[PDB]
Structures are given as C-alpha cells and as structure tokens.
Subunit: 259 residues, 4 copies
Amino acid sequence: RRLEGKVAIVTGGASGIGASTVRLFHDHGAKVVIADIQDDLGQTLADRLGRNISYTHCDVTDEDQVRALVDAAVAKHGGVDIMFSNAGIVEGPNSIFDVDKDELERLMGINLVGAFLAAKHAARVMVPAKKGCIIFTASACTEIAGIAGHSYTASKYGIVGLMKSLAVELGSHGIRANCVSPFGVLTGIVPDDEASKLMFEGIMSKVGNLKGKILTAEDVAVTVLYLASEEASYVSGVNLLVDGGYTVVNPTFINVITA
Amino acid sequence: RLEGKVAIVTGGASGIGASTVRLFHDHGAKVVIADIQDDLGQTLADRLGRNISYTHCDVTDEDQVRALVDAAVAKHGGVDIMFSNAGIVEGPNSIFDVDKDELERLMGINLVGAFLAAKHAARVMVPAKKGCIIFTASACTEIAGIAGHSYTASKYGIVGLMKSLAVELGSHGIRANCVSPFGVLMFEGIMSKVGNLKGKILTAEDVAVTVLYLASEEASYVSGVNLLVDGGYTVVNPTFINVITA
Amino acid sequence: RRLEGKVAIVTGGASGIGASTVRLFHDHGAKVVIADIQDDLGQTLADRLGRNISYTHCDVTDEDQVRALVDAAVAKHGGVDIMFSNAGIVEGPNSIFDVDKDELERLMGINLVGAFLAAKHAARVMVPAKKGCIIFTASACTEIAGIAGHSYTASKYGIVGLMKSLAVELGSHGIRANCVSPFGVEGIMSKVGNLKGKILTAEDVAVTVLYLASEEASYVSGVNLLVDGGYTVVNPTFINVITA
Amino acid sequence: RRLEGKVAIVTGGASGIGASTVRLFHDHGAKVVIADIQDDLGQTLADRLGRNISYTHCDVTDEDQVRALVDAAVAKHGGVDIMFSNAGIVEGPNSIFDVDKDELERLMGINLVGAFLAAKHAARVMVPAKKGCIIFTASACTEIAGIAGHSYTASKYGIVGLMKSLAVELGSHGIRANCVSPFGVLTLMFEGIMSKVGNLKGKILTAEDVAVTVLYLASEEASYVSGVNLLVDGGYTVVNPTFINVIT
C-alpha cells in the first residue's frame, strides 16, 4: 500500500511498539530489518514474516554496531527510507533520591545516545538519497510531568530537542524528522493471561482523559505509519502525541470542587 | 477507510474544504458540503454524487449552524466528523492595520464559527458517545510572522477551544484536534524559497489526507493535538545561521 | 525604587490584580493612570494614593475611549512607558452547551478586543518614543485545560498570540510585549495547588508584573510567564490512582 | 538587599553568568559558595568579595565532590536556600555528522548529569528544611532551533525536563525548581551582528542581565513560581522572519 518498495529500520523492533510497527510496515509492502538485542524474539519474528524482513543485532550504545546495521541494510535492499529509533528502557514516576548515577548514565546511553547515533548514521545514508524519513520514540512525559521517571523524562526531552534540530538541518536535503510521544501501552510490563490485561485495561479507562478506547501498540503503529507515509510529505519537527488529551489537562481543580 | 460515516465540512466549497470533501467522498463517508459559495458548493456536491449533499451555512448564524447540523443528523442518522474549516485569511501586517470592524468581522468568521460548530456538533455527537471535531487553525500558532495580528489571535483562541473541548468531550469518547497548515491560500516559487523542508510544495490535498488521518479510527487515541503541517518552519529561526554563514 | 519617572496605564486597575499592580507602581516611583469602569473605586484609589496617581474611566471595548485614555496619559505626563492590559472578565470551568453566542461575544470584546485596542494605541504612542513595555494578563489556563471556561480560555489564548506577534513587530523599535498567566484570582487552594506551603495572592502577580515591566527585564520579550506553582506542568491522575 | 540571610550555591560560579549572579547575590545580602574547577578565578573572586563569599572546587561529574560541596555549605552556614546549576559547556550550531560519541558523552556528563547530582544533593538538604530553590541554566534553543549544536540542544532540553518533574515532586515540601534559557550567543562587528540577529533591537544582552533574571527567580519575589522555563531571548524564539523577508 503506502510503503510499497520502501525500506525501514526499526530499532527495538522485536518487542512492544517496535514489533507492531514492524508488523505494520511489513503489511504495507516495506522491506524491513528488525533491529534489537532480544535475538530470539527478533530473529524468529523476521523469519516468521519472511522474505522482505531481515534481523540484525545492534546495541545502540556501540557506534560500530550501529554503522554496521545501516550499511548492512543499505547493501541488502538498496537504501534506507524510514528510521524508527524506538529502542529504549523505561522508568516509572519516582524520586530524584532514587536516581543512581550509574543507572542514570546507562539509561541516557540507551535512550538518548542511542537516538543520536541511530540518527547520525540514518542521516549519513539519507543525505545522498535526498529522500527519507526519521521517527523517534519519545513519550507523553515530554508535554506533561508525572507519568515517568526523572531520568526517563530528561532522556525523552533530549530526544525531542534532537528531533527538532534534525528537522532544521536535515530539511535542507528533503528528509523529515518527527517524534511520537505515546502513553503507557500494555506491552512493557509482564503479561499473564487475561487477568492482567483486563485489570490494566480498566485502569487505563480510569486515568485516561479520552475514555472509551484503549491504547494498544497497533494504535501507536498506525500513527507511525502515517508519520512515515508520504501522506505526511510536509510534516517535520512534529512531536505527535498519542495520549488522548492526557497531557493537556490537570483535573485537580474540577475534582476538588466536586466534593 | 471512512465507509458509512458522516462528514460536515464548513467552508467545503473552496480549496482546503473542497479537497477534504473530495477526499472523504473519494472513499467512504457521506459528506455534507457547507459554505456560502452555493454555486461552487452545489456544483461540487452534485458532481460528486449520492453520498454528497450541500447546505448553505453562514457560520455567524447559530440558527443556521444548528439547522445544518440537525438537517444532516436527520438525513443520515448522525454526525461522525465535524470539520470547522470555513474562515478568512490575512497575511502578516501591523497592529495599525487592524480595523476594529474588520477585526470583529474576521473574529466572527474564524473563532465564533468554530465555537458554534463545536457547540452543535457536541449537541449531536455526545449522545452517540462518538465523534470527531477537527479545526483548521494555522501555522502561526507556533511561530509568528506568517499571519496578521487578528488572524494569529483568532487561531490561538481556536486552539484553546480545541484543548478545553477535548478535555470535556473526552468523558464521552470524542476527540478534538487541530491542523495548522502553512501556505495554500509565482506563488509556489516564493513558497519554495521560504519552506524549511525543501523539494515538496504544500497543496490543499496534503491537508486533506492529514484531516483524513486525524478523523480515522487510525487516530482512535489522538485528542488535544495541534498537528502542524509546516515542514519544520515553526521550529527554527534561521537568522543566526543566515547572518554568520552568508 | 525601580520605576522612577515612568508612566503606566493599568486597564482594569481598579480591582484585584490591577489594583495590586497600581499600588506597587506607586510604591516604586511611577506615575500611574488607573483605567477601569468601576469609577468609584478607581478615583477613590487615585485620590488616596496621591499626586502621582490619576484615574480615567475607559470601557476598553470602545476604541475612541481607549485612544482618549492613551492621549490623556501622554498629555498629562509626557509619554507612556508601561501598558498593562489587565482588564478582563473571568469564567470558571464549564461546558460547551453553556456557551451563549451573545455572552461569548461580550467576553471576547472585553478580553481580546480590549487587549487588541489597548495594544494598538499604546503602540501608536510607543513607536515614536523608540521604547516601551506592554504586559497582558492571560491565565494559567493557557498551558492546561480544566481551570477555566471555554470562552475565557480562548480569549486568553488569543491574548497570547497577540502578545507574541506584537513582540515581533514592536521589537524593531526597542519595545517589549509579555504576558502573565497566574492561577488564583483558601483551604481549597492549598488542596489544588502543586507548590504546597504558600498561596498565590494578588501581590504576587503584582510583583511578577513589576519585574516583567522593570529594566530588570531589559531583554525579556515574547514571554507568557506563568505564576502557577507548577500546576500546569503535572497531570497527577496516574500516580494518584496507583498509590491508594 | 533582597537575599538577606540566604545561602546560595552557584556551580560554575567562577566565570560569566555564575560570576555575575555571585557578586549580585553578594550585593543582596546572601552568603554564596562559589563552585567551579577554575580554582584560580573562583578563589580570587571569593576573596575579592569578602566574608560572606567562600569558594569550593567541585567537578559536578563527581558525585562525591558535589555531596561534599552541599555538606560543606550546610556545615558552614546551616543549610542551603538557593542552588544555581549554572556549570556547563557550550556548543554552537553544527551538523550531526560532527557528533563524536566521546565528546557528546562528555558534554552530557557536565551539563545534564551535573544538574542531576547538583539537584539531588540540593534536595537532600532542602527537603528536611521544607524550603529551598533550584535553578538550572538552560538556553534559548529550547523554544527555537538554530542557535546551538545538537549535543547542547539535547542536553538543555533534558535539563528542562529534569526541572519540570523536579518542581512537581519537590512542590510537596515547598521547594521550587525553575530554568532560565538565555540567548547564550550574544553576551564593532559583534555590534553589527547584535543589530542583525536580535529581534528586540536597541539593547544588548549582558551577563548581568541574566544574573538579575536569576535573582528574581531565586528571590521571595517568585514565592509561587515553579516549573517555569523563563527565556531571556528578546522574542527571538517566537518568530521565523523568513516569510516577511522573502516578500520584501
């Protein structure tokens, strides 16, 4: 359909949002290369999807590995059209007294430095092609505070600013750099049959502002499909939230005055 | 796609409104062209065919807006998409070029037209616990210098409306988002010379597919978002680079 | 005394935030023109404060009245340094079904069109002076939804876009255009407010405006300075559900 | 004398904006503890100003040193009222092809991780006192892109997010956390570019200007200001003058 004959690299594409983006991009004609370090999940997936889907282990904290993944993909299919820097690790809401200098630098390496390096080499191969699309995974905590840890928030804020400066610089060559800032999708925490899904799906019905629909990974996948489609040929520098209006309301006032 | 949905497009006789209308017809929904260019509007709504009706509606008349909505809800069964596109534009100007009579008139067309479309779309959508309201703002919401003072302030108010609307209509499962395009309203040579994302020209069909996305079940969880279509123009002040590297 | 020899016009300056800013500007040397439509309160204040404080009735929805207010201030003192478009009417959180087209247009006139006109005639006299300072009153609802009505929200959003596009235009002459977006116009305030231990009074919004209008802000322009104690930066629904 | 009887710590306080805030805080009563790694400048300054101003070497990349700097101040004075995370290194506009993983990580350490540790240990002593104030040095590139490099841009954006969630968390105890995002660039031909690039014409952005903005942000005058990224840009980040300039 929308991605017939396009080539995509999806870091973290073996689990959660990346896996759904990978399945979706496959469904729309794209030549996709799963990139992750969960090698069983990743390689099994790229073989389950099949002919147009490859896998490539890549630690985003090692530039040699990153440069290798892009150049391998360039050699297999001909070029890179979509670069989805999804790989990251999360941190729930916490205190600054729970920030460990070690855990902090590790979190930053995976989230932000992985984003820089993934972008740097995506740009390196895209500039000569004068065509392309780069999409970062930030989070809703970029527009509101209180749904993520301090280091995780700070890492995703930097991801947003990087995406911005990328749109300016990389615009000169006609390739776009956008974000997506989804919410808490039911893929990160451990699954256990139907009890966990229904209870967590009920709490999302509680906390979310837009009630009646629940955020799946496929939902974030189609947002990225649009953001990566040529239907967005003039969208760049945009941090498109998929939050149902959570980051635009502090209902403390209404709820206190309704008691 | 949009099969079996209902669309109301204020300003659907010219440009962006007409392109979104042709798109919604092009696959799926039943569209109700609403504008005051009745020749253009009726010509289009007849060229398109069965699923496309027309209805004169001056957005400054709450009774006319109420009538258009209620006629469509009675004709098809309900209203799924409300596209508050109708408006008048004004390029960059001075505060001294604002005429209070022009000011209030433009404010009437842009901001009050959105308000009334919002109120009566909400009136018919809330009981269905469904709906989609999509405002046409402008790129001047994130940067200033591409629109006049009355225009920017009118679109800033549209955003605050959309925000507070999404919070309120969230309780019922209804989404309220904006789209803030750039310049579709020689012309294309200057547009290239200014745009940040070079190579691609911003047409009305571009916003049409953007609005289709925002209204699609593919956006089941997008609400409170002012989705710019600017190619990164509103996120850069190229003065520093242009002065120190020219 | 940070306002020695300056001239300020404070629309809505007879009640609340305007009255607090006006007493403050008096406290720092400034010659102030209280502008409102509550003529009793305004002249009482302008007589109690003393020589450097005058009054001028001005319905901001009447351009002739505002143009008169500007020129009266220019003729009385020599010029205008500060134009504080504070006058406005409030509307608490409500529904879209409670928006009345006539009541809507009234709030817009006072809030947005009053601000437009106050700016236009402040600009008219400030451009030739090659200096100036303009401060609008928005509200914390500029950054969050759920603490104000739909019409008030949209009017204050429009005020912000006005202030922004104005700071761009009036920069060429050395003129600044800023906003202030406070929270409290209480035990309830203690409960809702994010920054605990203190409370937003009118004097706080007044001293924020004093800074914004001082030379302490010589290069501050285009800013919508929130005074919310971090209310507009947190949606605690998630954490509050999971803590019990 | 607004800061009468207050105690302030300024990391990077031996040079520039930190130095301007330090003398300003001295002028307004406050007891200041200069923290930097240019030990010559800092001690020269801290003895220049006099009895209420001391100096303390502190590499913010060393959690042990920052913990010592905070505890030294509490041991000297009793507590910490103001913490100004000013220390950082700059990067002008660049390309992503000029990004070195070793340099990037170093800049990230000094700018963002130093902020985390300085904030963490300021909080360590401020929470029990149920009072305090944390102020970061960001930059004008937080609201516009085109006056800083990608590594600086991302580091100051992250500095903003830290301040936001910190203000959310530390509000419960009566502590405020704000940022200031000056126009770091502009601080004969220097004057020609000042006339050219700046939006608000007619005024020059000095370090003392940013110093006085921080004085307000740290003063009682901001008793209810928290979570705010107060830009000092003269409206630079609110206009893309390309459109008007092309049509002229």
